[PDB]
Amino acid sequence: ISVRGLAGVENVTELKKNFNRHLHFTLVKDRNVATPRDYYFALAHTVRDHLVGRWIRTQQHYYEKDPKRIYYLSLEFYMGRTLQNTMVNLALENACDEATYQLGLDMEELEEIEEDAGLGNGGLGRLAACFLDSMATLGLAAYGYGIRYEFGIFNQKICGGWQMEEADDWLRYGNPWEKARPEFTLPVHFYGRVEHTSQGAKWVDTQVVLAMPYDTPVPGYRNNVVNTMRLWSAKAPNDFNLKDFNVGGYIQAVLDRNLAENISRVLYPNDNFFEGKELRLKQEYFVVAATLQDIIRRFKSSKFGCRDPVRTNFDAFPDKVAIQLNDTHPSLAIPELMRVLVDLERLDWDKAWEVTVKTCAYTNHTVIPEALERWPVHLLETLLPRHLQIIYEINQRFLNRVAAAFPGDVDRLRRMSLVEEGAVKRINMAHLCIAGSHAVNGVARIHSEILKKTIFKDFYELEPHKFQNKTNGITPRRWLVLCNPGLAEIIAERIGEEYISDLDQLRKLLSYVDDEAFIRDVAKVKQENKLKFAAYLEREYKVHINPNSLFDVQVKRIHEYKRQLLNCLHVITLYNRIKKEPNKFVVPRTVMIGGKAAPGYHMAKMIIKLITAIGDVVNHDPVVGDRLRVIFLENYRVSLAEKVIPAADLSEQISTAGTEASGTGNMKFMLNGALTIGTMDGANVEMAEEAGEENFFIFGMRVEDVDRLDQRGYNAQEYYDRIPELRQIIEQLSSGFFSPKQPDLFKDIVNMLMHHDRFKVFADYEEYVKCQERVSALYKNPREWTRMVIRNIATSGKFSSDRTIAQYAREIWGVEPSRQRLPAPDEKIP
Amino acid sequence: ISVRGLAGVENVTELKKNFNRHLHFTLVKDRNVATPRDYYFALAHTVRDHLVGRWIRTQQHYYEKDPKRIYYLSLEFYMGRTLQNTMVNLALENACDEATYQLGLDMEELEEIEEDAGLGNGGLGRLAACFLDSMATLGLAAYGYGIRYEFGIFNQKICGGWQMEEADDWLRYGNPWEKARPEFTLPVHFYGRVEHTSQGAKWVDTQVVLAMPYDTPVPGYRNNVVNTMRLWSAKAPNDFNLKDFNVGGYIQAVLDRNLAENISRVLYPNDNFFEGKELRLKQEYFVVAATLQDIIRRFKSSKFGCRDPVRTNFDAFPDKVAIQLNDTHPSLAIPELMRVLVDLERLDWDKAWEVTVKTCAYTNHTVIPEALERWPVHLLETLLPRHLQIIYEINQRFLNRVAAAFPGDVDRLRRMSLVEEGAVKRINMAHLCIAGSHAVNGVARIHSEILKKTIFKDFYELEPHKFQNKTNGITPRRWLVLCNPGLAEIIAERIGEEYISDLDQLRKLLSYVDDEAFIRDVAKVKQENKLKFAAYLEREYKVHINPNSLFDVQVKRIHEYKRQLLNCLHVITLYNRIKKEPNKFVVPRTVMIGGKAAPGYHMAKMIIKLITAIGDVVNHDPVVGDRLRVIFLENYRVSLAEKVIPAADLSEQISTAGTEASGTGNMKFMLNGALTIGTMDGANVEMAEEAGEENFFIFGMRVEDVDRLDQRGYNAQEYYDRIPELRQIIEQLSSGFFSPKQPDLFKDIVNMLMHHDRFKVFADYEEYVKCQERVSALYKNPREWTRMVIRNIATSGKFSSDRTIAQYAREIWGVEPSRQRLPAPDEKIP
Ligand SMILES: *Cc1c(COP(=O)(O)O)cnc(C)c1O
Ligand SMILES: *Cc1c(COP(=O)(O)O)cnc(C)c1O
Ligand SMILES: O=P(O)(O)OC[C@H]1O[C@H](O)C[C@@H](O)[C@@H]1O
Ligand SMILES: O=P(O)(O)OC[C@H]1O[C@H](O)C[C@@H](O)[C@@H]1O
């Protein structure tokens, strides 16, 4: 059937009775009333049963051996569905497929019922999920720590061409994967004040919110390692949240509990944009405060909570603990770790600081200013009084270091401060992270260099040793084996199965680049994938596409820097050329654009309306026929990504050079048989460098050209003046060609493009359509297109998150990865 | 070990492996980290496994045979713990005891970990729980319908002698008994307006709240019948509760969902007191609206949703459905049933009314005016516009009936109206229930008569056939076998086990009233029970009592009508007499008073403070020694009741004649070997009538005397003037003898007692202490005390809820009870 494992005789039988056990005992139903949803839960519980045995022994193991623990703090974990992925990593897919078949059910149909765990916005949240899978696969004693939001990223609905947001109640029917652990509930403090008494400061008169943990298993790939992802839930204490007496109402007091619990209710839907709301800041401290207590508790036990030197010496803390900051969101971990060590454990400042800097590491994800976390001091002052005091003290000592290193450089002092003066004083969280971490890293080589040359130049000059680079990557398991079994199978037919946990081996496919059978096969799976997607489209969304056309897709969050607008300009150009010479042949294309816009991002929502507007015109023009279709992929999410990427021919990674830190969707497309048209931005550079620029469609300005243009001054009018095709499009938008009933509907877009384009869209237009012509030319030659595809796939190995993690492990965390199978799952009950 | 069933070889082994299965697979723990709480859950899941098989077949059965269904609507279901009760009804107690023993655990210790299901206030809520058990035991196709509050009755804490309320988060660790059924979620409407168009009225522009059901199994006693208790939870739709667009905030919109969901958040802690809050009215419509849709859906299927006459003829509705109203709380079921039949199903008014009256029945629980539900019309007008219109129309037609029956009786017309004029117009819910129900019943013979003679006299004259009586009762399973296995065993040694489901057979114990061994045994179990309670007291609450003293206990909600105050006056009297003649012998007593006061009931909370105040003085007076102890039983609830009642010698049921409708605690004490000192009120009359007034300690005014006194005019000063002992007590309270630091602390109590005593406490004082002397005299003669106890126990059979239900079944519901074992639980999987 494929290498989805063995469909053993004993195990298919075992699976079936357990499926029935759960349907009866767990779901309390009987075959005559069970619905596809009940069937999905019976299977889910059956699959979950197979990894609890391994989960327990993996955790017990770490307790016995006591290795260095890796804590990955992130406010986002974009997990997606977990049924299939678990089957894959446990080599249970074929057996389950067989068993459910014999039970007379379609597994694929049941998989579609599982709700996505959308606890993320985009890149940052998905990176964290890929990292978790890789860390488990490399046998690291790693824990994912975050917030269990009851409402993840909103579900997007397109009404009248506009985006409509609606609550993502992903827990409505329950989550069979998580395991509530009320018994490990911890208290977290807010507000209050600071008392300076005799021997130390005291954080007093605080409001308490409880943090209840929920554990979700993270199985490695076929090695029997099952790590833990612990998500915190907010819970109100029963006392003061009732006991602070003297009139108010008993009923009201109970109803008001949903005020402390609102902390974990919803994820902020902002991608690469900072919103200084109090609720956000509370979420950030909540995950940090709770997580640290858990970290120290585990440390206090270790082998020190037995003997060792005997005296809670936190000198070994950094040797046993490593906490990674996914961006600046969990940055309060730095002052919080100090608060505990100094205030509670009573270590002297300097010893505490040494421990802190040595166990923390920060990962930066973007260079755009509006994405930078700068919290107003009045907010920190009110909510976390003691932490503000600690930050000021950290700032005081750090600046003194700078003054001593650069005597008389007074501007450098204000530039590097963690405290920013002005309208309102703010705390620069990124500066806090650099100072309290022993390693700071970019997510792609060019991004890492830009940090050193630009944004954090002063910091780099101060401590050059801190700055590193760790190019992102994706997990080959979910992003290849799981979403594209067809491609995975043909690859395995030639080079084996070891590449799933050793992607570098894909290089061996280079020697089949002229193989006639392989070329035919690679081309065949892509065709089958396109056919399956085209079908899904009519199935779930309804209104036909042509599977023979080139599948041009751009899927990612809607941003001005991602330039979905530049994609739009090309689409309109194609249309206009067809309308000019109707009876001329052009390569057919289905351009698919999908993504979510943050609710308050007006421009982004205006762009979604433009895309659908273009589609309304283009898709109903009889002269165009089936040569050009414009489709807006609704509710883009992980599960939707697993469907479109395998069916894509052209991947669009066209951000303005220097704005996309790395990107990961790009890598997803490369490994799945799509060719890339993009700019020399983020990881695109390392991808073209790995595949050879000849096998990539690079166009536009490089970083240097962008900067030259800024010195000069960017004037969009010039481009409008010298390019008639560009002019024609802008006047079409301005006159209502795309919005008849509301002719001035797109005035904001035109106004912006002509007068305040921060991402110089017009500047890359000419080179962009010229380059698009080149891809169309190559698509006309199937054999050569496929051969170039083989060159990309065979060369994408460097982009596996296993490689990224192995580097973090060795160069930051100080641990050694291991592909050693944990001693089976085998029963056992001590 | 006792007759807690057989401890079979095959079944004790089977239990143990399943206990381990769950500990591993369900709890995801391993013996080395499992805590008593984990052990309790493994056992709970193991026990729950044994009744799912029976649950499924019982329900499937009713679907096949299609008998008349009984729907018990109640806003309260005071369930308590369910582990032991399930073991008892499934004859699993000994096997579980054995198995857990072999696993090296104490079952009793694990039982104590289960949280009470406190979804009730007192009598009314517990009656509903006893009824559910009896209905299952008598094999009736009955369903309990209510609200799944996430916060039940508050947990009471005594601080400084004052009651402190704190949230009852009974779901914190989860509920292994319930089964969420998200797939049967229903929509419920609120607000909106009424549109009168061409063919009928339309309820329009309504706010929608979803009702999600949770099913809990209700096993009958050893007959393999497992009925269902369905509790509704409020859930916000994802749409409008987000989709009603045009600024407000996306985050805020999501946070605001906890506004529609506040409907099922907390139970109103009012016992026999009406609070006209909107939230309450919403809870009342919510349970009614959701439940009815479920009832009709099941009816539409029946055997009509196949064939029968063919044409949704609701003429057979009353033949297939019976809905019982537990008080007036679910009274909106009457107009709601009409709304559906008329507005949605389009039946003519008269046909709809006929169906409605014929399927509904109302149970009244009290005669005090402040407990009566009179909803302001402006509230119904805003929240349920169409229902108000229907009520007015029902009122119009009913009054016309009255006018036609009593021509010219204009006062009778205003007196009987469902609408009350005055300050604000209100809707008398009790009048609504009488008019739209075919049967109205009291809960005790005297209460039932009072309804006919007083409160509902006019209604009785109009339709004498509606009014009935159904004396309350309690379940012998939880209230004897479960809480007092020792007494149950010795009874079974003589007369067998058939009495557990046929309590009348207790009469056979009358022939052992002179049996020397029995007298010794009955006396022995009571001593063992007292010893176990005295221990529990020091264990969990700490500060000694003497097990040889008479255990004088009064446990029920704190009310002015229950007269805990009269109990207090006696306690102080005892104290004062001892202080007068210290070296005189008096029978030792431990008087225990326990109960919860509604948060806003100032007097009730003042009484709790008085009780603890008396204890502070009495319990620390060296001259008193161990002869007199005053203890306030904290957090009285079902689980606490199962501990004190079996250990009681004297039961206090001293309400003012004519105020306690029936009472049920009284019956609990009678069946458990306690003698009763009380007034001729509620069921007390039927109890003394059953045991013989000679075996009861009756004192005080009868109803007639109370009324004579009211004609005359009650003057408390008279009693104060003629009774020196009474005078001495009042002046002690007034001068601070019981409150040194705050001498005027109890001025409200004294003021009330002397000037506004609605329950004439002083009037029953003399006869009360005189009578208390008589019980002390009899306690001095162990043999005779025990013999009188045997007379009460042997004669309590009439007070089993099986008898009550059998009567409801035959005289109201029109169904026949059956003690037929359902065809085993046996596997099966169709
Ligand atoms: C991989 C992924 C992303 C990131 O895409 P980029 O093109 O790097 O912005 C965003 N959303 C989802 C659903 C993803 O799977
Ligand atoms: C039986 C019971 C009641 C009712 O007691 P009465 O004396 O009839 O008021 C109240 N609360 C609990 C805990 C009960 O078990
Ligand atoms: O003790 P910590 O590491 O917090 O948690 C360890 C626990 O993790 C998971 O919930 C699985 C469970 O078997 C294990 O006992
Ligand atoms: O169809 P209704 O009567 O609503 O519910 C019937 C269901 O009740 C319970 O949840 C047990 C389950 O086995 C049964 O199928």
Short mmCIF file of C-alpha atoms and ligand atoms in Angstrom, two decimals, chain B residues 78 121-124 126-127 271 474 479 555-557 561-562 636-642 645 652-653 660 662-666 668-669, ligand 2:
data_model
loop_
_atom_site.label_atom_id
_atom_site.label_comp_id
_atom_site.label_asym_id
_atom_site.label_seq_id
_atom_site.Cartn_x
_atom_site.Cartn_y
_atom_site.Cartn_z
CA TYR B 78 -28.94 17.26 44.97
CA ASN B 121 -30.17 23.66 48.08
CA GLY B 122 -32.00 21.32 50.36
CA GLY B 123 -35.22 19.34 50.46
CA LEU B 124 -36.51 20.03 46.96
CA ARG B 126 -32.70 15.97 47.33
CA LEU B 127 -36.27 14.82 46.70
CA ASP B 271 -33.92 27.78 50.00
CA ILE B 474 -36.48 8.89 50.77
CA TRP B 479 -30.30 6.48 53.20
CA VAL B 555 -29.37 19.48 60.53
CA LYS B 556 -31.16 21.36 57.72
CA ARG B 557 -30.94 24.77 56.02
CA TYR B 561 -39.40 28.78 60.31
CA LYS B 562 -37.22 25.76 61.13
CA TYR B 636 -23.70 20.43 55.94
CA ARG B 637 -24.29 18.57 52.68
CA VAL B 638 -25.43 15.15 51.46
CA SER B 639 -22.11 13.41 52.13
CA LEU B 640 -22.01 14.95 55.63
CA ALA B 641 -25.64 13.87 56.18
CA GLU B 642 -24.68 10.25 55.46
CA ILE B 645 -27.81 10.76 60.70
CA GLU B 652 -35.00 17.74 65.87
CA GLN B 653 -37.98 18.57 63.64
CA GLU B 660 -42.79 22.77 56.92
CA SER B 662 -43.23 17.77 54.63
CA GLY B 663 -39.54 17.52 55.38
CA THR B 664 -37.40 14.48 54.51
CA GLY B 665 -34.53 14.65 56.96
CA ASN B 666 -37.09 13.57 59.56
CA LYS B 668 -33.90 9.84 57.25
CA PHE B 669 -33.48 9.89 61.07
C1 LIG C 2 -32.49 15.42 53.28
C2 LIG C 2 -31.64 16.73 53.16
C3 LIG C 2 -32.21 18.01 53.36
C4 LIG C 2 -33.68 18.23 53.78
O1 LIG C 2 -33.77 18.33 55.19
P1 LIG C 2 -35.12 18.81 55.95
O2 LIG C 2 -34.85 18.56 57.37
O3 LIG C 2 -36.34 18.25 55.30
O4 LIG C 2 -35.09 20.39 55.66
C5 LIG C 2 -31.44 19.10 53.27
N1 LIG C 2 -30.10 18.99 53.00
C6 LIG C 2 -29.51 17.79 52.82
C7 LIG C 2 -28.00 17.75 52.78
C8 LIG C 2 -30.27 16.63 52.88
O5 LIG C 2 -29.68 15.38 52.75
#
